[PDB]
């Protein structure tokens, strides 16, 4: 409905050309009934031409993603820190559009690739569109925008054969990481659970760069944007993410779409760390450096307002595919900093839309339009939709009475550069020495994970580096990892049969910080939307009756329940043939269905051992599992799952079963089921 | 109207970016007051990017042109001959847009080049956009669309140096004409006054091709479109066209704009010749052949309705430059014929818009939009401005209830191919023998011109062919001209010092037809809008008083009056410095200004002899000229203009002068002032 | 090779701009060591501009695929059935490029999706480029090219949310299949092991359409192309295909690349079924119908020659991504039929390259160039890489002595339409009744599989 003016309804009417002539489109015009097709068939050509030209270039990065509409609401009048209009009153509402994404994969690649994730937010403010183009990880791989093609060439598929898709698990990527040590911080994040988030709803957003808040009196402060998930933080496990990439490439976009449709639209607190200009170098690193984070212990979050996504697009292409974000879409009250990564981005995103749109009027696309008047002397270009009345589009003029008027700090609520900003020194292509510590913060991050999380990170590196063919690259990787942590280097080296280099303790330390750990962020605050598969059978009416009773009790608490059986009928959502443990956050077997879990169990209706495999996979991936009905021993024995296990449930009573099971869904993952290096 | 919704008003307000953020655009952001410009200046880059991308490819032909809005009104219910909805009721009104053009010149070439002219009309009908993409000449140079690049390459500038602009007066064009005899008919028309019309308003429009009118019962007839000017036919003379190309390259577009602004918007009767399918070959040629005309003596005109242009565009680029005509834009009640020129056009115009627009959604540009709902399954593409609600865009479907429905002869007022049409025979790349007479109709045309018009045509050929460097091409040209008329070939040969080949009488004849002659079409039916220059002086109060008196009497009758003097003041529109005879349809000298017309007359305010030259040029070019307000033999003697001449006026009385002079403006051209062969 | 001249070696030397000026590309130019980046940094902007414009529109179908170079060798002089030059002598070798693909998925989608597969072969013949743009299944879903967007919209992701990727397992696809019964034959093939081949090497190629072989004397025969794998036929099982789509999205392109690198480049016998014009309707269906196959029991294969793929590309983008196939790339000795599916394709492939390339000169891309001289009056356009010497590019001319000369049946080894072809009847948008049996051949196919 925010873009309702542009909607086209095709629920009634006769087929027309694009110029409104009624036509048909099902048979070609031919010279006789078995004859050749005629060139004069305009119905054919207009239709096929349109089809032939449907595609546009995918985004150069973040090609794979999905979007939704929502609302931002301010929690206060923030005039005291920023002139930004959308923040100027308690309760003030601004429409938003958000797109989430991976980075490296092409447009049909799997959502559950291991990657950095995009989190791009447009605020359609009453003083212009404002975009915060962020990621789910607070730090970036490189310290200068000029290096971006080098990073991206290295992580994208090898350019002779275009292998591998959507993965850093190849020689070129690890060559780059090992030769460019700035990469270490983002690399540790990507190799953690933050690389495989459970959903877009269960990840945070970060602006990464230091920006400025600028007041109407001209004074400024330095800020970092943090969008903090109200759904909690959660990750997949890698082995799960891999199967899920095959069983459901669309998992994150389906999860988001479904949450919105069920009235469970995700929320984030839009927050900032705010510090003085004088603190640019007070925290032990440079705030211009996008590889560094300010620990919350040094600078607490201020909650500015609520972001809620609650409406899905009408047409994916027109809205999600065509949305064209820019950090140059800035409003009065915000300003840039001299972060050399940010500085270069400002060029890139204005330029790249020429590629995507194929012409310069991409801001006139519905999803890109602002919600306030446009007054400027920009004219013409391919695809020009406006018919400008002002026939004197130059400044200065008298023939249009000096309009449009110039807007600045003192008139017309103009954008203005923070007036205390200066530059000094030589014009240089040199890196600030203040940027040179690439290893301390990677170590702070590693130190801040729980022991099982540290093991998962080590295991991601063991997985990826084991697939690097070059022994020289592997050696170089261990050299870099060793500068962060000797223990990481030793543990990774053991999987690839190299020796780790001797400890180099220059950057070793034991400091920790709060809020980076997924495992350590406590049970989820809500289990609404989490998926429960109930494994049943049509061969026992009692099994379907147990399943119906469980359904009622679980749906009441907002869980999405799937009853699985051999064949569809009323009460049964999915067959075993299409079911997989990657489809559920918890698995329940009804004890009327125990016969399906025997080793002699076979059916033409699903793959051999599928029922048991679902249960076993769920258990092994750390999910809450259980048997409901009181006869648990046949299922749990076939699965080799101990009755006494944490996150294993066995109760006769449906109500008792569900109460226990729901504590398990909040715990989310039972990390005791993962072996640790000694 | 799609146009009104996209109008943008910039008569008030502060400058904004394209996303509504208020900004400035007059100074670059710099590192210090004398410092380098910053990459983070998004104000700079968005403005310059837009500027950098303002241009689009000019049309491949008809690049130079001008457009206006109007209305078409049907004179009757034409159901008895066509199902076309815009013709279905007396008084039914349909909005139109017309673009007029030359063919060969690039976008900034002169209006008054010698060329064929475009006359392209869009009817925004209640059953879809219908375009008649015509010319001011009823026949085309070639008989097969596949030859169009050959024609166009030959007439456009030579591709090594891109010389000459907007002219057929070079070897390649005459080589093509001489080797491709089909060209002879259109060549004679372009070499007549039809090549240099006085204005877009003083020329007719022709669809050229035979089309079909198709009734709702399925029966069809063959038609030719003729748009007959209500302003009359008028031409420049060549020497005038040449000076005018330099003094005012915008002459025809200015004329059109001014006529509309003064409430003199031009009108045409939209007419057809209508004949039976059985007459395809009855008139001595093939109605599928686009080098042939049906003489009105064999098939008279039926007036279908009135076309009036009465509103100028708001933005030239958005409306005139972007309008994208297609003969594929057809409506129920009209059909194509197997004219091989027409057949190929249908392909070209859909394809070429991809070039111009850079993307497939060019029908969404306001000027291209229809005025009825669009219901189809065309999706995506660069520049997609719609948000389609229908998420099952395929036929056949049940998930969108089978909508959109197919439209055809029987339902939904669908377009349908005339059901009587057939094809028979081999699949061939062969020209019909019925097309082979390239010379009889050029002769009919030449025979139908008056003696002075025949001389102007001979003189245009003498001019152009004298500029052909190759003696072989010149010989080849005479061979072809000789097949039309031995007399033409003899008379043209005399100017280039070759002998004409012996008479070859195979195609010679003495037949004539009405309605092709400009000179023979009698006085103009109105003199409104015609331009009178009054040559006066500031050195005599009496001269300005004579000028004012004449002004009053001429403006009363809707003439556009310019008083010329040495310097501007109240009552004086233009200086001698800026004045030229090409600016006027008639020239009057006031008796009090006689001193300026002496040979010793000199001034720092205008070139030597300018006043007299204007008068003499006007006389020489056949225009009504006179001296008003005494016994006024001094100006006529200085100019060597005889008082007794036709179109020369000499009166003391303002009233008597104006009454005589206005009959001269209606006569328009005094052809007795041009010498004839023998 | 048009490619050899365009190879660029970067194994030595200093970084340069695209105009040969030595530069650096690792740090932005800034006003001071902690200062803002300067607009005057041309090194920055040229590098980022290039990066920002690296992507081009993926193909509208068959976006997911991979290619290799090879050679075709004729087994005989086939003059007795076709004038085609690449078939005119025993042992005659023609370079080829082949791209294999899925249909429905986007770039980055998994190789082991269940789908129809593309098998597109370019023969760079000594009389022009000849493309056979085929699939691994011999029949197509629809009987008229105007329906193609309907088919493709139905099988591609639902357009509100773009779910699901690379799959017909959703409502819209099965709605279309159930409402358009022509789809049954190809549906059965796609739902068999032919939908999930073990590799590109283990599947066959088919032209699908009936074409014509035309002799120099003007006589013609009807043909069907079958490229028969020398590696044998093999399929995945579905449960395996699903896991493989997650564990190795690059499975088929890796398999092909590896086989070529190890000296096991895949081979096919390029074969035809050949029948007389008079047999258009002899086999119990219409040979103009692309939902029908001629049983080999009625028309046996003739082996024409050997196709071998034996060299991987140097640059995927420049070769594989940019190769632009067209059924309009036809040579003397081959002609079309009035198959309404084929007829419409001829339009689509010329048009769609404007989308991909962004300009009209896509035949000048090295991978698209022929291996013979080009002589025509095509001029200008964005990205014009030639400098044409002929300054009179029109026919007829005397100023360039009538060159280039027209080629036809009796001149310059011109292409010519088979001269026995005719058309007759009303100009109609009507389906031939001869196309109406949508179910017998699906049943023949099902009957011909083993019980498992
Ligand atoms: C100098 C080049 C460059 C650099 C250094 C970056 N990016 Fe970027 N980014 C691009 C150049 C770019 C781009 C090529 O301009 C893209 C591709 C599509 C588009 O619209 O912008 C893009 C897309 C893009 C999107 C997808 C937006 C959407 O959903 O459409 C996200 C979330 C980001 N980027 C986030 C970042 C973050 C958080 C960065 C570092 C802090 C970052 N990028 C650095
Ligand atoms: C096979 C190609 C071809 C052939 C045989 C013709 N033309 Fe055409 N014409 C074009 C290819 C074309 C074009 C390249 O497609 C243009 C350029 C811009 C456009 O929209 O279409 C065009 C533009 C064009 C315009 C300008 C429309 C405007 O103002 O925007 C007119 C008036 C004509 N043509 C009229 C004719 C007439 C009366 C023809 C013969 C009866 C003719 N053309 C044959
Ligand atoms: C009317 C449109 C239409 C129809 C009926 C078809 N296709 Fe097609 N096909 C296209 C329109 C198209 C296209 C849009 O024009 C593509 C996409 C990009 C390109 O080069 O052409 C294409 C690509 C394409 C490719 C990929 C070539 C490559 O690897 O680059 C193959 C293998 C085929 N198709 C095969 C077929 C077969 C065997 C068909 C039926 C027998 C068929 N197509 C019908
Ligand atoms: Ca690699
Ligand atoms: Ca984790
Ligand atoms: Ca373009
Ligand atoms: Ca020339
Ligand atoms: Ca029809
Ligand atoms: Ca669907
Ligand atoms: Ca199989
Ligand atoms: Ca032919």
Residue numbers in the entry:
A (entry chain D), B (entry chain A): 21 to 698
C (entry chain B): 21 to 472
What does the paper say about this structure?
We therefore generated a series of site-directed mutants around the putative 3TR/catechol binding pocket to further test this hypothesis. The residues Pro158, His246, Gln293, Ile313, Ile314, Glu316, Leu321 and Val536 surround the 3TR binding pocket and are structurally homologous to the residues that bind NADPH in the mammalian catalases. Specifically, the variants P158W, H246W, Q293W, I313F, I314F, E316F, E316H, L321A, V536A and V536W were constructed. The catechol oxidase activities of the H246W, I314F, L321A and V536W variants were noticeably reduced (50–92%) with respect to the wild-type enzyme, whereas the E316F, E316H, I313F and V536A variants of CATPO had little effect on the oxidase activity. However, CATPO contains a C-terminal extension, residues 533–537, that does not exist in the NADPH-binding catalases and that lies across the upper region of this pocket, preventing the binding of NADPH. Val536 is part of the C-terminal extension of CATPO that blocks the upper part of the NADPH-binding pocket in mammalian catalases and thus it was surprising that changes in this residue had such marked effects on the catalase activity.
Catalases (hydrogen-peroxide:hydrogen-peroxide oxido­reductases; EC 1.11.1.6) are redox enzymes that are responsible for the dismutation of hydrogen peroxide into water and molecular oxygen. The structures reveal a homotetrameric enzyme in which each of the four active sites consists of a pentacoordinated iron protoporphyrin IX prosthetic group with a tyrosin­ate axial ligand. The heme is deeply buried inside the protein, with a complex network of channels providing access to the exterior. We have previously shown that in addition to catalase activity, the catalase from S. thermophilum (CATPO) possesses a promiscuous phenolic oxidase activity in the absence of hydrogen peroxide.
